[PDB]
């Protein structure tokens, strides 16, 4: 069976620490996803519990992260905070399906460009989510968020193994309460937990038409969650030693999200930062995560009236630094295509404020580049008419085409009089196809050889630029 209770003294303590670090995360992420803090705190609690009992890698905190929230933020403003519940249930179902089929090993196939793009987009979206707290601006907001960043970045060089964010929140709370500062408090953005999570059957979604609208977000949530769980797992593996079955971990994740959805909760996955803070502080048991969730619930129930008094500047500061911690990568001075994928995801997510779309275009772009690495999909065939005129029959789909490969398939050795270019069986899906053909024709014309284009409009009609 191999089930233990080793090192309770350190596991409990670690769980306490990461719980104190867990409260503001869940509250904030709840606000970011346009929902009550209650949902996030509940999520963190129940997920931590179920993962503590059914998780694969002990000492790994699974609660509520932005990686999940920013994928539901669009579902909640279009259908509600409850289509969210359905989506979390279905998400968990997809995860236990993924674990039952034993498919974790395939997570390696996921392009690094897509992932790093997801991270960047995520972080800058966090930072952008902190902006609507500045549109209605009192200078107390600015002063307390600036002093927040200040105390978070300048205090820990003097202090010890206790969070500077803890001191930030406590101090700013005490100040805001005593001085009676005029600023938005957390209790305004949503209701905070006052009791235990009750069994809430998603009474709000309805069968099929619901399925057709929650399936995509459940898919993306599931995949992102399993990726996060995988990498977090492996990092805990490297930090210590284990033969953790990532399939069992995925299953536990699934069940957790399922019952979470059935108890009015958000969607959750593994948390890198808090898992690291945990293992660093001595947490390596399941009791660590259990005590994390439990002490989280107990403490949020204990400090509730004090909790709702916490100024939004503190939490917006904490989010402001968590964003910074998340974004910064290797901004390389490398494969152009992969960079294209990352920047595509980033820019699209930034412009649309939809992380799911960035993920989507990342997937399809990676798929296209893959098809370009693995197959042909287009070939030219030089044919001679009795006139002695070279006619190049371009057949197939042309997207992201390389100009070099296109030029190499044409003969420029002997400048003929006239050359026919047949596009009757071709399809241009990108402006690069155009550009390539242009380089060819420009080369021929510069060489003194005239070009006759055939069956053209059909090929240039498949252009994506036609929207």
């Amino acid at each position: 069976q191999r089930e233990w209770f080793a090192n309770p003294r350190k596991d409990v303590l670690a769980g306490i620490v990461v719980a104190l670090a867990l409260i503001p995360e869940a509250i904030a992420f709840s606000i970011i996803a346009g929902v009550d803090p209650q949902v996030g705190l509940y999520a963190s609690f129940i997920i931590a519990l179920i993962t503590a009992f059914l998780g694969g890698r002990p000492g790994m905190i699974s609660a509520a992260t932005g990686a999940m929230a920013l994928l539901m933020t669009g579902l909640v403003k279009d259908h509600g905070i409850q289509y969210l519940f359905a989506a979390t249930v279905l998400t968990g179902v997809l995860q236990v399906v993924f674990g039952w089929a034993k498919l974790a090993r395939y997570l390696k196939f996921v392009p690094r460009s897509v992932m790093v793009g997801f991270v960047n987009a995520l972080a800058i979206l966090i930072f952008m989510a902190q902006l609507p707290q500045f549109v209605g601006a009192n200078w107390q907001m600015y002063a307390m968020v600036a002093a927040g960043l200040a105390i978070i970045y300048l205090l820990p060089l003097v202090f010890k193994a206790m969070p500077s964010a803890l001191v930030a929140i406590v101090v700013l709370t005490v100040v805001a309460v005593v001085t009676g500062a005029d600023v938005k408090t957390v209790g305004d953005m949503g209701t905070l937990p006052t009791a235990l999570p009750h069994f809430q059957f998603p009474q709000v979604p309805l069968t099929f038409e619901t399925l057709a609208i929650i399936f995509p977000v459940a898919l993306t949530l599931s995949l992102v969650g399993l990726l996060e769980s995988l990498l977090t797992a492996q990092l805990i593996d490297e930090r210590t030693d284990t033969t953790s079955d990532k399939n069992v971990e995925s299953r536990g994740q699934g069940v957790a999200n399922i019952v979470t959805g059935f108890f009015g909760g958000m969607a959750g996955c593994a948390m890198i930062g808090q898992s690291m803070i945990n293992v660093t502080s001595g947490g390596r048991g399941r009791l660590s995560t259990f005590v994390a969730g439990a002490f989280l619930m107990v403490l949020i129930l204990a400090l509730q009236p004090l909790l709702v008094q916490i100024p939004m500047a503190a939490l917006v500061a904490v989010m402001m630094v968590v964003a910074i911690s998340t974004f910064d990568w290797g901004s390389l001075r490398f494969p152009k295509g992969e960079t294209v994928v990352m920047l595509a995801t980033v820019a699209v997510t930034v412009f649309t404020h939809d992380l799911s779309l960035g993920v989507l275009i990342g997937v399809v772009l990676s798929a296209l580049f893959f098809a370009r690495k693995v197959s042909q999909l287009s070939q030219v065939t030089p044919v001679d008419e009795v006139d002695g005129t070279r006619t190049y029959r371009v057949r197939g789909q042309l997207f992201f085409v390389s100009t070099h490969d296109f030029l190499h398939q044409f003969d420029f050795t002997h400048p003929a009089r006239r050359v026919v270019i047949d596009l009757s069986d071709a399809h241009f899906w990108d402006g690069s196809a155009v550009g390539a053909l242009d380089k060819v024709m420009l080369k021929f014309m510069r060489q003194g050889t005239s070009v006759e284009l055939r069956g053209l409009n059909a090929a240039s009609a498949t252009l994506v630029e036609r929207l």
Partner: nanobody, 112 residues
Framework: ESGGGLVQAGGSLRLSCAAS????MGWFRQAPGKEREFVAA????????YNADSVKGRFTISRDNAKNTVSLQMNSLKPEDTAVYYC???????????????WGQGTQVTVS
């Protein structure tokens, strides 16, 4: 750009484009309300490029000896040639579409 006017059933018309402002010069035609279409393009070297879909071997492009002039001879016009003919002077690139450095507002060409 100059040469717009009215044409009959099998009539003809030459279109001289002047650049008042340099490898290659082009000509496109825009059907009213419909997607733009390529007509022809000619380089300094002497190489031509036609659109055998819109130009069924009827039209004839040539560059004048003058530095800022390109002529497009148009014969055997038909109801579907009725369009606005734009002259482009983009150089060293995009011989075929989407334009480059210079464009010129097009004139109307109507057949009957």
């Amino acid at each position: 750009e100059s040469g717009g006017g009215l044409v009959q059933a099998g009539g003809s018309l030459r279109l001289s484009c002047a650049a008042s402002g340099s490898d290659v010069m082009g000509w496109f035609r825009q059907a009213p309300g419909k997607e733009r279409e390529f007509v022809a393009a000619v380089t300094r070297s002497g190489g031509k490029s036609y659109n055998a879909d819109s130009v069924k071997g009827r039209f004839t492009i040539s560059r004048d000896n003058a530095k800022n002039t390109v002529s497009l001879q148009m014969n055997s016009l038909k109801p579907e040639d009725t369009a606005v003919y734009y002259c482009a002077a983009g150089d060293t690139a995009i011989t075929s579409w989407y334009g480059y450095d210079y464009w010129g507002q097009g004139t109307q060409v109507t057949v009957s």
